[PDB]
Each structure stands twice: as structure tokens, then as C-alpha cells.
């Protein structure tokens, strides 16, 4: 996260670190949606242009974390993956359309002060909250700058941007399954996700029922925190029928 701040203890208890076993490294963010299911970006697990193709055995899920590098004894939980499910129409060949994946854990994780699931939006939530100017929140252990690394989880709040402005900022073809967020050059404020943050959640707090909802997944960008560029996010609600189908079947 560029131009964010240190998270508070327990601020994002749904935050998940995807951790490569060999070599040991941060792969991506992700989120806890039940005791047994983790949500992330498909590009975190599968991207053939860069020869990325992770299997269940390649990585671990670390939950309840605050410190990036420390083994947080008596606090974090480490889980193994049973099965990865990538959206069958994930478009890595063109423009990263439908950038979403699920991971089922080998065993359910116990909830705690530090570990707790985020809500997924329904149609009404999406209609109420997904409006230009409305701010959401992005968290992760990724890069502090485009060109080091944080001691603890970082947080930044960012406004949803008008679709024409998103469209006009890039040569890439934007789909209804994506939205963009970030400040404009004229707005004075800054902030973005960066390398290490992708797959992680974009959340909003409903002012109607005071619950946090994951509206987005950190998907793609051009650099990090560049003037006139915006981060792009998978639209979670638009892909919820797929999410439900996978959880119902498996």
C-alpha cells in the first residue's frame, strides 16, 4: 500500500496472507469469508504469461496477522489448502476479466479477536454503496512505493471513480466486472495498492446495518499511485452467482 498508514490491531480481521512455501515469500492478499473459504484474485494463482501456476501444496494461508514477517505466536493461524477454484471464464488472455478465485481450507479456522469473516454484498448492498465518490478501504502487506516493505499491515481509504474517468485513464478494455478507485490529480490526496497487495479486499461499511462488506478484490493497475491512473478491482457482487455455485457444490 502506497501512502497509507499502519492498521490498528483487529482492524481487518478478515485479512489473509497468501504465503509461498519455497522460497518463503508474500504472494498476495486474500480474505476470510467463512470458517472454511478464502477469497482472492485469480491472477494470484494462475497467470500463464509469467509461468505462474500454483497448486494447493505450493502455498499456505496465514490468518489473524498484523506483523508482515514475524511468526505471531498464539495469534495467527496457519491453514493448508484443500482445493483451489478459479473462475472458468477468467480472461487472462485479454484484459483480466473475472479476476476471482476461491480456496477451500483443509480444516475450519477458529474465530477470535483477530480472525473473523467479512460479509459478501447482495444486490441491494451493491446498489446502495457502489457509487462514485463513496469511499472504501484497501489493506495489505505489499510495497510502500512503486520503485520498501512495511513492518505491519497497511490501510488506505479510497473513493470509487466515475466509469468514464476509469475508462479514459487506460488503453485496456474495461468490463462491467471491474470498477476503479483512487484520488484524481486535482484532489490533493493520494494512495493505492501495490505489489504484494493484490488479491486482497476492498471493503465498505454499510451505514444501514453497520457491517463491513467486501465490494472488490485488488485486481490490476499501471504502476502504483501514479497521477491520472487508478487501481482496478474485481466487482464481487457481479460474480456472486459463481461464488455461491462453488460453495453450494463443494
Amino acid at each position: 500500500i502506497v501512502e497509507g498508514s499502519d492498521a490498528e490491531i483487529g482492524m481487518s480481521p478478515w485479512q489473509v496472507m497468501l504465503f509461498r512455501k519455497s522460497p518463503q515469500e508474500l504472494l498476495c492478499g486474500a480474505s476470510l469469508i467463512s470458517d472454511r473459504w478464502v477469497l482472492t484474485a485469480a491472477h494470484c494463482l494462475l497467470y500463464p504469461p509469467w509461468d505462474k501456476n500454483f497448486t494447493e501444496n505450493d502455498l499456505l494461508v496465514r490468518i489473524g496477522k498484523h506483523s508482515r514477517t514475524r511468526y505471531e505466536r498464539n495469534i495467527e493461524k496457519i491453514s493448508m489448502l484443500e482445493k483451489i477454484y478459479i473462475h472458468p471464464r477468467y480472461n487472462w488472455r485479454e484484459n483480466l476479466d473475472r479476476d476471482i478465485a476461491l480456496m477451500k481450507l483443509k480444516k475450519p479456522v477458529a474465530f477470535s479477536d483477530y480472525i473473523h469473516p467479512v460479509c459478501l454484498p447482495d444486490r441491494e448492498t451493491a446498489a446502495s454503496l457502489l457509487q462514485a465518490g463513496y469511499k472504501g478501504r484497501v489493506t495489505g502487506w505489499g510495497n510502500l512505493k512503486e520503485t520498501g516493505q512495511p513492518s505491519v499491515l497497511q490501510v488506505v481509504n479510497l473513493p470509487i471513480v466515475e466509469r468514464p474517468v476509469c475508462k479514459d485513464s487506460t488503453r485496456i478494455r474495461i468490463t462491467d466486472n471491474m470498477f476503479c478507485a483512487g484520488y484524481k490529480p486535482d484532489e490533493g490526496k493520494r494512495g493505492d495498492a501495490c505489489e504484494g497487495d493484490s488479491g486482497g479486499p476492498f471493503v465498505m461499511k454499510s451505514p444501514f446495518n453497520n457491517r463491513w462488506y467486501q465490494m472488490g478484490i485488488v485486481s490490476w493497475g499501471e504502476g502504483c499511485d501514479r497521477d491520472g491512473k487508478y487501481g482496478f478491482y474485481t466487482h464481487v457482487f457481479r460474480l456472486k452467482k459463481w461464488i455461491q455455485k462453488v460453495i453450494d457444490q463443494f
Binding site: 515469500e25 511468526y71 496457519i78
Partner: peptide
Amino acid sequence: FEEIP
């Protein structure tokens, strides 16, 4: 990263 047990 610190080693995991």
C-alpha cells in the same frame, strides 16, 4: 520472514 513451526 521468521520461520514457521
